[PDB]
């Protein structure tokens, strides 16, 4: 969040 | 004041159909791709992580690989449409569309799937 590339999670957030 | 809106918050689709979930956001003039992030999520699963024109499908959750994509033609129209192809039963549930485009908002959309002979 907001690395495209990394995985996000809710709400912005990197789980 | 930045608001995401959905024309529909409940989709009822057949197993195996195609489905486009719409998610609308305010675009005043031309779309400023350098400003736009789109996040589609469904119950702890990452479907779309669009950043300023760039996506890694390596981060799309496996159950959506090949089947889910962002209709990027529609973003100029302020429509972050998620197209899902060959709809499965597991696709049922609550989808979130989150759009950061200067400001940020999100909306929840429910998908219900009917099995082939229900």
UniProtKB/Swiss-Prot annotation, chain B:
Family membership: Belongs to the immunoglobulin superfamily. BTN/MOG family.
Gene designation per UniProt: CD274
Tissue: Highly expressed in the heart, skeletal muscle, placenta and lung. Weakly expressed in the thymus, spleen, kidney and liver. Expressed on activated T- and B-cells, dendritic cells, keratinocytes and monocytes.
Residues of the full protein shown: 18 to 132 of 290
Function recorded in the entry: Plays a critical role in induction and maintenance of immune tolerance to self. As a ligand for the inhibitory receptor PDCD1/PD-1, modulates the activation threshold of T-cells and limits T-cell effector response. Through a yet unknown activating receptor, may costimulate T-cell subsets that predominantly produce interleukin-10 (IL10). Can also act as a transcription coactivator: in response to hypoxia, translocates into the nucleus via its interaction with phosphorylated STAT3 and promotes transcription of GSDMC, leading to pyroptosis.
Residue pairs linked by disulfide bridges in the UniProt entry: 23-97
Ig-like V-type domain segment(s): 2-110
Post-translational modification: Ubiquitinated; STUB1 likely mediates polyubiquitination of PD-L1/CD274 triggering its degradation. Ubiquitinated by MARCHF8; leading to degradation. Deubiquitinated by USP22; leading to stabilization.
Source organism: Homo sapiens (Human)
Induction: Up-regulated on T- and B-cells, dendritic cells, keratinocytes and monocytes after LPS and IFNG activation. Up-regulated in B-cells activated by surface Ig cross-linking.
Disease cited in the entry: Truncation of the 3'-untranslated (3'-UTR) region of CD274 transcripts leads to elevated expression of CD274 in multiple cancers including T-cell leukemia, diffuse large B-cell lymphoma and stomach adenocarcinoma. Disruption of 3'-UTR region is caused by structural variants that stabilize CD274 transcripts, leading to overexpression. Increased expression in tumors promotes immune evasion and tumor cell growth by allowing malignant cells to escape destruction by the immune system.
Protein name per its UniProtKB record: Programmed cell death 1 ligand 1
Domain of life per record: Eukaryota
Subcellular location(s) per record: Cell membrane; Early endosome membrane; Recycling endosome membrane; Nucleus
Glycosylation-annotated residues: 18
């Amino acid at each position: 969040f907001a690395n495209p590339h990394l995985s996000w999670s809710w709400x912005x957030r990197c789980g | 004041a930045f608001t995401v809106t959905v024309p529909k918050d409940l989709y009822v689709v057949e197993y195996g159909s195609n489905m486009t979930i719409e998610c609308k956001f305010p675009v005043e003039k031309q779309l400023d791709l350098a400003a736009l992030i789109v996040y589609w999520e469904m119950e702890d699963k990452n479907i779309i992580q669009f950043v300023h024109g760039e996506e890694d499908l390596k981060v799309q959750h496996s159950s959506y690989r090949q089947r889910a994509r962002l209709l990027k033609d529609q973003l100029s129209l302020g429509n972050a449409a998620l197209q899902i192809t060959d709809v499965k039963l597991q696709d049922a549930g609550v989808y979130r569309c989150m759009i950061s485009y200067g400001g940020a908002d999100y909306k929840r959309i429910t998908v219900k799937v009917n099995a082939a002979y229900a």
